[PDB]
Design an enzyme around this catalytic site. Structure first.
Site, mmCIF file in Angstrom:
data_model
loop_
_atom_site.group_PDB
_atom_site.id
_atom_site.type_symbol
_atom_site.label_atom_id
_atom_site.label_comp_id
_atom_site.label_asym_id
_atom_site.label_seq_id
_atom_site.Cartn_x
_atom_site.Cartn_y
_atom_site.Cartn_z
ATOM 1 N N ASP D 26 0.736 -1.402 -0.079
ATOM 2 C CA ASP D 26 0.028 0.149 -0.122
ATOM 3 C C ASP D 26 0.809 1.279 0.441
ATOM 4 O O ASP D 26 2.200 1.670 0.975
ATOM 5 C CB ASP D 26 -1.172 -0.185 1.456
ATOM 6 C CG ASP D 26 -1.457 1.729 1.141
ATOM 7 O OD1 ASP D 26 -2.261 1.773 0.119
ATOM 8 O OD2 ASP D 26 -2.638 1.243 1.868
ATOM 9 N N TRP D 51 2.794 -4.871 8.357
ATOM 10 C CA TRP D 51 2.235 -5.549 7.983
ATOM 11 C C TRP D 51 2.704 -7.130 6.729
ATOM 12 O O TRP D 51 3.939 -6.817 6.487
ATOM 13 C CB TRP D 51 1.373 -5.470 7.175
ATOM 14 C CG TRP D 51 1.283 -4.661 5.534
ATOM 15 C CD1 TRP D 51 1.131 -5.245 4.951
ATOM 16 C CD2 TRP D 51 1.810 -3.146 5.561
ATOM 17 N NE1 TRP D 51 1.154 -4.498 3.719
ATOM 18 C CE2 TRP D 51 1.669 -3.271 3.995
ATOM 19 C CE3 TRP D 51 2.722 -2.024 6.370
ATOM 20 C CZ2 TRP D 51 2.412 -2.123 3.285
ATOM 21 C CZ3 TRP D 51 2.639 -1.099 5.209
ATOM 22 C CH2 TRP D 51 2.582 -0.598 4.577
ATOM 23 N N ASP D 70 8.371 -0.212 5.820
ATOM 24 C CA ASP D 70 8.136 0.928 5.525
ATOM 25 C C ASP D 70 9.381 2.503 5.366
ATOM 26 O O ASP D 70 10.384 2.320 6.889
ATOM 27 C CB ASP D 70 6.985 2.242 6.129
ATOM 28 C CG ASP D 70 5.902 1.949 5.473
ATOM 29 O OD1 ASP D 70 5.620 1.167 4.705
ATOM 30 O OD2 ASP D 70 4.627 2.204 6.185
ATOM 31 N N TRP D 102 3.186 1.369 8.659
ATOM 32 C CA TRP D 102 4.109 0.989 9.557
ATOM 33 C C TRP D 102 4.981 1.538 9.867
ATOM 34 O O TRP D 102 6.288 1.095 8.861
ATOM 35 C CB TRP D 102 4.069 -0.152 8.829
ATOM 36 C CG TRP D 102 2.934 -1.430 9.546
ATOM 37 C CD1 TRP D 102 1.853 -1.507 7.899
ATOM 38 C CD2 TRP D 102 2.238 -1.484 10.178
ATOM 39 N NE1 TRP D 102 0.248 -2.424 8.804
ATOM 40 C CE2 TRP D 102 0.997 -2.315 9.684
ATOM 41 C CE3 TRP D 102 2.167 -1.427 11.325
ATOM 42 C CZ2 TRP D 102 -0.016 -3.208 10.881
ATOM 43 C CZ3 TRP D 102 1.585 -2.250 12.622
ATOM 44 C CH2 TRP D 102 0.350 -2.390 11.781
ATOM 45 N N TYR D 113 5.242 8.518 5.703
ATOM 46 C CA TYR D 113 4.910 7.507 4.793
ATOM 47 C C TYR D 113 5.435 8.167 3.676
ATOM 48 O O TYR D 113 5.244 8.764 3.158
ATOM 49 C CB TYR D 113 3.590 7.534 4.398
ATOM 50 C CG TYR D 113 3.672 6.472 3.279
ATOM 51 C CD1 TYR D 113 4.147 4.642 3.710
ATOM 52 C CD2 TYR D 113 3.855 6.118 2.317
ATOM 53 C CE1 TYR D 113 4.063 3.748 2.677
ATOM 54 C CE2 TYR D 113 4.591 5.015 1.264
ATOM 55 C CZ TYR D 113 4.274 4.159 1.231
ATOM 56 O OH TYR D 113 4.309 3.288 0.718
ATOM 57 N N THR D 116 7.890 1.894 0.157
ATOM 58 C CA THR D 116 7.775 0.680 1.260
ATOM 59 C C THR D 116 8.793 -0.534 -0.032
ATOM 60 O O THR D 116 8.162 -0.626 -0.710
ATOM 61 C CB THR D 116 5.962 0.356 1.101
ATOM 62 O OG1 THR D 116 5.170 0.265 1.416
ATOM 63 C CG2 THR D 116 5.598 -1.602 2.073
#
Ligand code: HEC
Ligand code: HEC
Ligand code: HEC
Ligand code: HEC
Ligand SMILES: [Ca+2]
Ligand SMILES: [Ca+2]
Lengths: 376, 354, 129, 125, 376, 355
Positions: D26, D51, D70, D102, D113, D116
């Site tokens: 994500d 995750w 992240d 995360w 963010y 990822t």
């Protein structure tokens, strides 16, 4: 042929298959080289903005930098640091204003300095590269202040401190020549030499008026600090060259970038960073298209190239996209960089043939300023 | 009746018979040769005018009658801002009220009462013919009716095209008859884009039919006391000119120290400047606005006295939102504003510009 | 939408970049974020400073001075973005220059750019334009 | 690019939203902003939290646990945006939930963010 | 029939023709009414965000509110204020974090409160409307915390101040039911009732576990504070209805939003705000489409409408765009609002017929959250 | 020779003749019935082991020999982190070095020197046949050769499938033979996504061929002194166990307080826990990690003593980046981790899970 993304997949698949371990970690940017290019994204006046660091040779993003409102990028010619002057607010776009200068390491991209500028002195404008400038040594950054009056901020990067504001007359842009000297361009059509000893008023000497009230010099001239060369187009394609290598302003012979018949048939420069200058080749590049007289801020589809000494058109490039800003790497057999605010894409061409080599899309919301280091 | 009424105002305007000792008329302090200002020297220079008794000095600079007829009657508008009226403090509703008050003011024309005025009018054969034709027979025997009629005539006279001719170079340029010099043109552009236009244009936006370079509002721009005028006026060193708050029926302390925005038309010829004649020069008056914007030490200095401007007479209710524009006028732009403002001179007063 | 073709003013839609009063607008039309042709949206601060242009009114064939004033203290609206440059000059003639953020004099010293209004402030008479 | 059709893994381009390791990514692929498949770009800070998803590798027919971590302390990259949800559970099963930022455990408490990464941390079951 | 840009150019030319004057100034937004709608733009994780305040009837943006990093918006039902919990950093996305609440006047859109939250305690997650929530009387804001443990922060809007964090069990979301009480959904499949004072281990009670570990309850249930109705879809479009009106949880019968044949043919709920509930009509709206079982965050093209008492389907609209989020005005004759993240556009539909009435475009970078006030 | 060498190791492993007063073998402290740990009660419970002399207590918990053969030889890798080796402080390079050291340590097996070991080996007819077949005639007459051969045999025996059978429930599940219970499944998931995986998985990324739930690195997790073991060991109240810094030839003060990350295989049956046997319960050893993440007062408290955990024995070099994860294990996830780690029990030790 094979995209960096496919090769990565194979690198990764081979790593998995052969059972190589590897620690996830923060990468380091490849050492700054001639073919590294920085693209800034003013983001159409958004409160926060992005600078993109790009390997121009491989056409890959090799890091980014965050910035506040309409920040000023500078790149140290020798490669030793980059920096900007930036602006944030306590509540996004509202509340307490802090103007500041950051100095970054150019491989870690970690800030090595945060220098607060008192009394929020920064000129808040659509980004002009030469409204904040590094000096030959890189020990001082200077920036433009417009309110209450034209002025120039002296910042000491080495001692990590703001120093003072310099009084100047009605003048614009900053082109430093020495650790203690710079030229600006004044309303009255002159250039001002400004030389400052810290402790009171600087010595101000204007040159001769070098263009009429009704000849218009653009917001984005090109300047080579190592060459002392300033290259200032007018709205019509005319090019003022001023050589500053002596310490004082010598004016070179002005030169047309567009022929008499081309001008008559509606040819004009237009875009943003409309002009580029190559130090070793003493050669000028310019964005041109067929446009009306007051569409001087719009994308152009052609680049022209000419000998700075004579003015002889060396090639006309059909670029293939709507280009807003151009620049060149300063190595032998350079790259022509062509950035489209509309496409959010940097197109990278051979500055000899003008054939598009590769392109880096997705650079923010309205990227406009391309900066390169002059490293030899 | 319109021609006639005004014609009577004309005679009255230059009649010294309307002053207590018959020494001065309206024209004495409102001299037609000087854009209807006072050219006479007193104890304080040209700053303030001397009354009928030959010694009494006003505390305020005598202002031009040119274009006064364009000012709306005094009123509070929908957002609480007072607009219009006559006198630097708006104490008169209109031209008519104003005529009466000036006629009665003891430091000026100094008539004892409406009745003394009536007697003076009654004395003159041409006034009997003139008033009776306009106001009816025996008007001059009613002190009230006589006084009010005189005031009306005076008002009607100041509404004649002659007091507001709209024949300045600025006016000619707007009709397309001539062009501005590049200096004047830069001037005008500066005027319409800088803070000046927030107070010295009729409207907020749109185009005025008969622009007189004032929005008729009330502002405190924070001027100092004019030391020599205040000494001369004899009001005392403790006295504070409260501006609009002095108007009877105004109780709101936010109005204290606020004065009527004057029309800039003929400003080049009507020095000295401000409500108290404190500045002799048009350039100074412009440069004064720089005290709110500029960071240079020279901005704190009155180029006339070579000393700091001085504390505001009234330190409250300053129009800071307008005046702290964050932008400083350089010498270039001050030159330009001068050139512009000079183009606001009526045709008949252009000789005076030299 | 030939971006290079001579700009053609209309007097029928204020939310479009070819509306006549926007002849030297830079940024965003305030009417698109809850302002109006000549007012700022709620929460923003109206500047006192401006750049002017002379804009031709195709309705009455007259030219009017438009003083662009910015509404500040908010992030850029993102709606109805426009950039026209009729008579626009370089920064050294700031009266006519529109890359500058004209937020001077805004309440609370707001200097961030939200949108631009287009009020008429006079009838033109000009020398470069 | 029928966004509603069953997601189809490839093992040939990492910068594309259908790359097999990205089956519950994500946000943005770090390779696109100067990181790599399994490293953060310069200036960003590597979180320690993740995750997971089990992602099928079309190269070897095996399924691997992918721990998305992240890179934080920078504004979102804007490059190669992607959103996939194979096995993604609601927030109450945060182990498998991918709307959560995360960034926990990142140096200097960075929590914004940027992008990822997609490292393998085990074989699925 | 005619656009609002045209009626302004028509009105404007009439003022300029009549010498109608007007002072440039800062508008007041119209009074808040039933038909007003708020659209939030989490911006795909951008460090700064926007909220668009919209008049649903005219399809006009009436105002905007700047936000930080994944702010959580609230809207007081009675129309008296709106607010957000929001997050900023001293250097764009780097540096010291400040989390704060702002309360806004709904007509001036000026902030009337700015309350700091100590120790930067907000949950940073893609935006879920019920992760931050107003008590019915509008006196307290409750925000969810995830790190280091699920917890719920209490913010006194009346005294303009942070109160305390509450320790709660491993649960999620906040549905307030009283000035001093709210419910959460726990990992274990129960709902937790949380009742709290100024100090005290709060009284915590659990309902029945009401779904197995493998029935999946979406991040975006619809909750109506004035009906006490929590409407909760699963991945399959089975819907749990809970009635908290009595102050304790009563469970209504579960209803299927899609037929068994539609489920056999691949119909699932999918998108962001997938469910809406109209209180006066006691009615449910679900975004649904044909999709693979793990494509539950992708957009949907269909809205199904069902009686909440019975489960009876009333309508199946075809939206004619890719829709990520839905909501409804709470007046009689409601508007079905439908947001495209992809299109950055709010489509405004008649909820009875489904006909598209008008749209509002250009709502940022990745708009996702629609909020309405229940003023009825 | 591989079978044979190992078969010799087996004999040596249970021969008390390798202790000074002939009272204990490797199998005495490394008991095969208890996952090669010590089931014996001393002055400090099961925390530390009693030596050959019947009184001397070590300062460190006796660890499992299960899976110790999987540990790389001791080395500093390219980023300056020490990996591998044997003992809690890495003072032995490999299984072979370690065998020799244990035999000579005076608080344990306590042989005086290599020659004393040689004499003992020489005394037994089966050792003469057995060593001479593998090492050459007269090996036992060379104290150096003999001792070295002995250690080699002991090492070869600990490399047999028997010490590392990879037959746990976790192993069966990864083969596809069984499923996890939902609790165990949740446990595993928590283990791979929370900080545990940063130290207790072989690799940073990828899949391990023979996972033993340790990266073989050195970390100080900030454990307190185990007071009763420290008293019993008689090293003194001023003594500080410096961990890896104790290894000869390590001079770097950043290593002080660091201990080898133990394999979590058979952890459910090898209590008490940590290098000093300080916690009796597996659950406590998990809860300990909450001291770095949780805000609740209960997290400061050792549930065994009802009192604060205690000051770290070494306050520097703590693995804070890893340990301060910003995320607290609630009781649910603790139970889950317990269920998962229990799955790491060797087939042959499953009966032991019950007590
Ligand atoms: C000097 C003794 C004067 C005589 C004789 C007349 N006027 Fe005057 N006038 C004088 C001063 C000092 C002022 C300003 C006073 C103040 O407190 O503001 C005025 C003002 C006016 C005005 C108002 C103009 C404006 O405010 O913009 C008008 C219309 C005016 N005066 C008219 C007027 C008439 C009709 C006179 C004869 C009846 C007359 N003035 C005489 C000074 C003196
Ligand atoms: C309101 C905030 C104003 C702005 C902005 C400007 N002016 Fe002004 N001006 C204003 C007032 C209230 C007054 C009279 C104040 C008093 O107490 O007397 C004036 C006066 C002048 C004058 C003198 C005219 C005369 O005495 O007859 C001049 C020449 C003048 N103002 C010029 C001027 C300029 C050039 C401005 C832009 C820099 C400007 N004013 C702004 C109110 C306000
Ligand atoms: C390094 C940063 C680690 C982290 C993260 C986790 N563990 Fe660990 N563990 C580590 C070390 C160096 C040691 C030995 C410490 C000492 O000095 O004695 C341990 C020990 C354990 C044990 C007991 C092992 C035994 O005595 O046989 C357990 C059960 C354990 N660790 C579990 C565990 C869990 C569940 C973690 C996630 C919450 C975790 N560790 C993280 C190093 C590190
Ligand atoms: C009781 C005293 C004994 C005896 C009879 C043996 N060992 Fe073993 N052992 C003991 C302790 C207290 C420790 C920890 C020591 C420390 O860290 O200082 C050990 C350790 C080992 C190890 C290392 C395991 C690891 O670090 O992961 C091994 C491989 C080992 N011991 C093997 C071994 C052998 C071969 C023995 C007979 C020669 C032997 N042990 C006996 C306690 C005791
Ligand atoms: Ca005067
Ligand atoms: Ca143990």
């Amino acid at each position: 042929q094979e995209t960096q993304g496919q090769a990565a997949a194979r690198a990764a698949a081979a790593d998995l298959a052969a059972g190589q371990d590897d620690e996830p970690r923060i990468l380091e940017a490849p050492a700054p080289d001639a073919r590294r290019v920085y693209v800034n994204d003013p983001a159409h006046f958004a409160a926060v903005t992005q600078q993109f660091v790009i390997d121009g040779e491989a056409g890959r993003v090799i890091g980014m930098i965050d910035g506040g409102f309409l920040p000023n990028p500078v790149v140290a010619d020798d490669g030793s640091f980059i920096a900007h002057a930036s602006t944030v607010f306590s509540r996004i776009a509202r509340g307490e204003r802090t103007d500041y200068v950051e100095v970054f390491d150019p491989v870690t991209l970690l800030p090595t300095a945060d220098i607060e500028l008192p009394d929020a002195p920064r000129f808040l404008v659509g980004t002009y590269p030469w409204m904040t400038s590094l000096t030959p040594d890189g020990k001082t950054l200077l920036f433009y202040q417009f309110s209450p009056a034209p002025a120039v901020g002296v910042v000491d990067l080495e001692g990590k401190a703001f120093k003072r504001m310099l009084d100047v007359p009605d003048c614009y842009h900053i082109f430093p020549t020495a650790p203690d000297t710079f030229f600006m361009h004044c309303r009255d059509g002159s250039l001002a030499k400004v030389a400052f000893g810290t402790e009171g008023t600087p010595e101000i000497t204007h040159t001769e008026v070098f263009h009429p009230e009704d000849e218009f010099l653009i917001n984005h001239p090109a300047y080579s600090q190592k060459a002392g060369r300033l290259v200032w187009p007018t709205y019509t394609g005319k090019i003022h060259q001023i050589d500053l290598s002596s310490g004082d302003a010598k004016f070179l012979p002005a030169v047309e970038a567009l022929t008499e018949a081309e001008r008559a048939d509606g040819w004009r420069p237009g875009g943003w960073q409309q002009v580029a200058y190559h130090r070793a080749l003493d050669r000028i590049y310019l964005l041109v298209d067929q446009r009306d007289e007051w569409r001087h801020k719009t994308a152009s589809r052609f680049v022209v190239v000419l000998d700075a000494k004579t003015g002889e058109r060396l090639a006309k490039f059909e670029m293939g996209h709507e280009i807003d800003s151009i620049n060149v790497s300063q190595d032998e057999k350079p790259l022509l960089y062509a950035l489209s605010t509309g496409d959010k894409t940097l197109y990278i061409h051979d500055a000899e043939s003008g054939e598009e080599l590769r392109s880096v899309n997705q650079l923010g919301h309205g990227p406009q300023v391309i900066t390169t280091a002059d490293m030899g | 009746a319109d021609d006639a009424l005004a014609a009577l105002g004309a005679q009255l305007f230059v009649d010294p018979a309307l002053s207590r000792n018959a020494t001065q008329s309206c024209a004495t302090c409102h001299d037609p040769a000087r854009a209807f200002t006072d050219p006479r020297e007193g104890k304080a220079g040209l700053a303030v005018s001397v009354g009928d008794d030959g010694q009494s000095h006003g505390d305020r600079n005598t202002p031009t009658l040119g274009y006064a007829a364009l000012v709306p009657a005094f009123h509070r508008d929908a957002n609480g801002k007072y607009k219009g009226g006559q006198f630097w403090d708006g104490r008169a509703d209109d031209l008519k009220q104003q005529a009466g008050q000036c006629m009665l003011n003891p430091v000026e024309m100094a008539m004892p009462d409406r009745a003394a005025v009536a007697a003076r009018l009654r004395d003159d054969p041409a006034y009997r013919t003139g008033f009776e034709a306009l106001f009816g027979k025996g008007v001059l025997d009613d002190p009230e009716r006589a006084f009010d009629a005189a005031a009306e005539a005076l008002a009607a006279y100041q509404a004649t095209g002659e007091f507001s001719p709209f024949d300045s170079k600025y006016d000619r340029v707007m009709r397309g008859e001539e062009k501005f010099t590049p200096l004047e043109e830069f001037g005008y552009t500066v005027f319409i884009t800088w803070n000046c236009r927030l107070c010295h244009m009729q409207r907020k936006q749109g185009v005025a039919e008969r622009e007189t370079f004032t929005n008729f509002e009330y502002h405190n721009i924070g001027l100092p006391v004019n030391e020599t005028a205040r000494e001369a006026s004899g009001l005392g060193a403790d006295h504070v000119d409260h501006g609009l708050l002095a108007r009877p029926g105004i109780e709101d302390p936010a109005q204290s120290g606020r004065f009527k925005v004057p029309s800039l038309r003929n400003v080049a010829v009507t020095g000295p400047y401000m409500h108290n004649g404190v500045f002799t020069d048009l350039r100074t008056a412009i440069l004064f606005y720089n005290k709110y914007t500029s960071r240079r030490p020279e901005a704190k200095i009155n180029p006339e006295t070579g000393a700091p401007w001085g504390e505001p007479e009234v330190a409250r209710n300053l129009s800071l939102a307008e005046l702290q524009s964050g932008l400083m006028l350089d010498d270039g732009r001050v030159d330009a504003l001068v050139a512009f403002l000079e183009t606001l001179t009526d045709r008949r007063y252009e000789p005076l510009l030299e | 939408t030939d971006p290079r073709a001579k700009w053609v003013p209309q007097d029928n839609d204020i939310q479009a970049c070819d509306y006549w009063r926007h002849c030297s607008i830079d940024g965003n039309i305030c009417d698109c974020s809850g302002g109006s042709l000549t007012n700022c949206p709620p929460g923003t601060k109206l500047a006192t400073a401006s750049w002017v242009a002379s804009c031709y009114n195709p309705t009455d064939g007259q030219s009017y001075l438009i003083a662009y004033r910015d509404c500040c203290g908010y992030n850029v609206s993102g709606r109805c973005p426009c950039l026209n440059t009729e008579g626009e000059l370089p920064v050294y003639r700031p009266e006519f220059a529109n890359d500058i953020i004209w937020c001077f004099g805004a309440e609370d010293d707001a200097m961030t750019y939200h949108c631009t209004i287009s009020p008429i402030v006079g009838k033109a008479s000009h020398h470069h334009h």
